Amino acid sequence: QWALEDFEIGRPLGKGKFGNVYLAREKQSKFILALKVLFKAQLEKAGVEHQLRREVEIQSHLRHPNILRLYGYFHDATRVYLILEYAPLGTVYRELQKLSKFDEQRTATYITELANALSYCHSKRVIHRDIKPENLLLGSAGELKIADFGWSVHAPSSRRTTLAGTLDYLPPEMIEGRMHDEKVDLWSLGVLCYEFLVGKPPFEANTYQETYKRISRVEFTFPDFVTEGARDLISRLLKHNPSQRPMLREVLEHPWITANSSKPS
Numbered sequence: 001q002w003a004l005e006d007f008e009i010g011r012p013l014g015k016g017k018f019g020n021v022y023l024a025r026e027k028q029s030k031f032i033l034a035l036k037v038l039f040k041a042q043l044e045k046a047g048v049e050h051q052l053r054r055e056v057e058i059q060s061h062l063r064h065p066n067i068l069r070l071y072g073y074f075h076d077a078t079r080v081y082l083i084l085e086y087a088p089l090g091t092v093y094r095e096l097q098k099l100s101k102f103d104e105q106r107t108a109t110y111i112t113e114l115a116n117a118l119s120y121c122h123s124k125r126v127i128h129r130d131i132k133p134e135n136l137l138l139g140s141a142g143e144l145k146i147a148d149f150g151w152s153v154h155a156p157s158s159r160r161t162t163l164a165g166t167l168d169y170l171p172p173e174m175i176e177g178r179m180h181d182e183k184v185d186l187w188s189l190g191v192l193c194y195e196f197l198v199g200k201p202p203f204e205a206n207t208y209q210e211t212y213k214r215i216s217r218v219e220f221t222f223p224d225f226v227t228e229g230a231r232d233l234i235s236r237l238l239k240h241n242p243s244q245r246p247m248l249r250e251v252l253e254h255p256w257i258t259a260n261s262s263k264p265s
């Protein structure tokens with residue numbers, strides 16, 4: 001169907017390990033979108049063809065206001081192209097670098113929206129496994145949206161591939177290459193909530209080997225300005241044994257969330 005000639009390319013939107021993303025308009029309809037460009041030689045080299053295929057399939061058959069749509073794809077001897085919904089207000093990552101910290105109202109609202117999209121996701125036994133600020137995008141009304149389904153699978157699961165970048169958002173079971181399930185996503189939720197209110201993730205460290213340590217021992221402390229309601233939720237999500245982590249109905253109805261969030265479930 002589609003080909004490169006059908007588009008006009010505009011400004012760079014972001015680089016990833018593999019993805020190079022651009023603003024684009026389709027010629028006969030003037031439709032604006034995002035074009036994620038991958039190099040076949042980089043994909044062969046690293047052996048992650050299976051990740052790309054899975055990203056394509058999951059993200060095209062899901063439909064939820066808090067999850068970024070995937071429309072289509074095509075390739076051309078050098079490259080594979082994905083056609084994505086455009087997110088006009090950017091990443092949560094950049095927003096956190098702008099403000100340094102989020103207030104309780106902003107944080108709670110963000111957590112509500114993640115918990116809603118993840119709930120829809122888990123109801124098909126799909127687990128994301130890569131929830132971090134670089135992969136949360138912002139809609140035109142400011143609403144949060146989940147992207148980059150490259151690492152997602154069906155539960156239960158064993159780990160596949162080498163871990164490339166940061167460990168900061170991973171649960172103990174996953175860094176230790178043990179078996180994992182839906183509860184990895186909930187651990188990341190607690191990691192995320194803490195980073196919203198403090199400005200940095202709870203297990204941050206100078207080296208790989210020591211981040212590894214702090215994560216498997218669950219060594220985090222709160223600074224003085226973290227309120228009791230916050231502390232309660234974050235302590236319930238960051239438990240070493242997964243089955244002791246709360247379900248998502250419990251996150252959505254926690255008193256601290258219901259008091260500060262500005263959207264319903």
Ligand SMILES: Nc1ncnc2c1ncn2[C@@H]1O[C@H](COP(=O)(O)OP(=O)(O)O)[C@@H](O)[C@H]1O
Pocket residue numbers: 013014015016017018019020021034036068084085086087088090091134135137147148150
């Ligand atoms: N749909 C989009 N709209 C706007 N910016 C995007 C979009 N998709 C990606 N980006 C930017 O490009 C970056 C890389 O995208 P991503 O899909 O996560 O690639 P990779 O899987 O290689 O990390 C994002 O962190 C973001 O900054």
Ligand SMILES: Cc1onc(-c2c(Cl)cccc2Cl)c1CO
Pocket residue numbers: 040043049050052053056073074075080
């Ligand atoms: C759906 C899909 O996603 N990536 C590809 C793909 C293509 Cl076109 C070429 C090389 C490697 C890959 Cl992984 C396909 C098609 O099998």
Ligand SMILES: [Cl-]
Pocket residue numbers: 029031
């Ligand atoms: Cl269209």
Ligand SMILES: [Cl-]
Pocket residue numbers: 119247248249250
């Ligand atoms: Cl639930």
Ligand SMILES: [Mg+2]
Pocket residue numbers: 016134135148
């Ligand atoms: Mg990414």
Ligand SMILES: [Mg+2]
Pocket residue numbers: 018148150151
């Ligand atoms: Mg990816």
